Design an enzyme around this catalytic site. Sequence first.
Site, PDB file in Angstrom:
ATOM      1  N   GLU A 122       0.887  -1.169  -0.014  1.00  0.00           N
ATOM      2  CA  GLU A 122      -0.046   0.142   0.078  1.00  0.00           C
ATOM      3  C   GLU A 122       0.914   1.430  -0.101  1.00  0.00           C
ATOM      4  O   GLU A 122       0.543   2.484   0.503  1.00  0.00           O
ATOM      5  CB  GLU A 122      -0.883   0.010   1.274  1.00  0.00           C
ATOM      6  CG  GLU A 122      -2.202  -1.001   0.982  1.00  0.00           C
ATOM      7  CD  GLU A 122      -2.937  -1.445   2.022  1.00  0.00           C
ATOM      8  OE1 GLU A 122      -3.472  -2.452   2.189  1.00  0.00           O
ATOM      9  OE2 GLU A 122      -2.781  -0.815   3.189  1.00  0.00           O
ATOM     10  N   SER A 152       4.385 -12.233  28.519  1.00  0.00           N
ATOM     11  CA  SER A 152       3.332 -12.345  29.586  1.00  0.00           C
ATOM     12  C   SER A 152       3.561 -11.964  30.950  1.00  0.00           C
ATOM     13  O   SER A 152       2.697 -11.901  31.686  1.00  0.00           O
ATOM     14  CB  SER A 152       2.514 -13.655  29.496  1.00  0.00           C
ATOM     15  OG  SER A 152       3.340 -14.720  29.910  1.00  0.00           O
ATOM     16  N   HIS A 182      13.531 -15.343  39.340  1.00  0.00           N
ATOM     17  CA  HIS A 182      13.847 -13.907  40.052  1.00  0.00           C
ATOM     18  C   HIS A 182      13.996 -14.377  41.623  1.00  0.00           C
ATOM     19  O   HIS A 182      13.753 -15.317  42.074  1.00  0.00           O
ATOM     20  CB  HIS A 182      12.881 -12.650  40.052  1.00  0.00           C
ATOM     21  CG  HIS A 182      11.599 -13.058  40.917  1.00  0.00           C
ATOM     22  ND1 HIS A 182      11.450 -12.988  42.074  1.00  0.00           N
ATOM     23  CD2 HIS A 182      10.454 -13.372  40.115  1.00  0.00           C
ATOM     24  CE1 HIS A 182      10.194 -13.251  42.464  1.00  0.00           C
ATOM     25  NE2 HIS A 182       9.431 -13.533  41.419  1.00  0.00           N
ATOM     26  N   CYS A 233       5.861 -16.547  38.240  1.00  0.00           N
ATOM     27  CA  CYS A 233       6.963 -16.323  38.332  1.00  0.00           C
ATOM     28  C   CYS A 233       7.831 -17.569  38.770  1.00  0.00           C
ATOM     29  O   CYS A 233       7.068 -18.393  39.564  1.00  0.00           O
ATOM     30  CB  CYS A 233       7.451 -15.104  38.941  1.00  0.00           C
ATOM     31  SG  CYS A 233       7.307 -13.918  37.870  1.00  0.00           S
TER      32      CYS A 233
END
Length: 258
Positions: free
Chosen positions: A86, A182, A187, A205
């Site tokens: 386009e 997500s 950690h 987590c």
Amino acid sequence: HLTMPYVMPGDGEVVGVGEPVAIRFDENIADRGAAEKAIKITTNPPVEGAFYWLNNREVRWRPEHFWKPGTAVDVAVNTYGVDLGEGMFGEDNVQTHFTIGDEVIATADDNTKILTVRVNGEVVKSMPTSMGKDSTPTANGIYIVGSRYKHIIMDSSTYGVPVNSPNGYRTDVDWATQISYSGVFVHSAPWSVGAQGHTNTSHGCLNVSPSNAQWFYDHVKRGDIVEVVNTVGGTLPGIDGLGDWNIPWDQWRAGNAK
């Protein structure tokens, strides 16, 4: 009427065996076919790969299997003078060169609540973990390691869960390694050391000890792999952003250039 492409990983970077080539444009791409045609990927040793679009602005390229360590990859994004649909044309051409480091695959098995880190097939660390509790489980699947942070706040409202709601949180964490868009990280979790290796207590987590999280931060790199198995969750979506490997090769190869 011009779009700039951006390529990842970075020029000269060393990445793990799960790292896809990412080409992201700053505008929507009307003609995915043309964009793919303008992108030349060379590997040494040579390996077959294919494009799959994650969204209207970002395409990914990867092999069927994880990269072989030591592979050199060259990316040429030749969009100058290409109509990318386009009447949108490349602002410039872009090149990147990167290389694949050691095979680093860390497997979190919900049956054992151990995250085992394997380097070129040998176990180098066995880390007790506490993953998502049943009501907020960790998805199974193959996650690609992304960015790392010595300290950040994870805020559930990023993912459309209010901080004030039952599954909500606004949590300061040390030694955080992102493994999904997500919002799954590995950690430091001093608060779940008792539960690590026994019981899932998190929102999704992979909680590990401060020393283990620091080790993971120091030693695991962009493109390395975390595989989660045997949880009560679903499967990380292929289009997560770091979930590329969950799309089977047949479907990936077929592409979605439409």
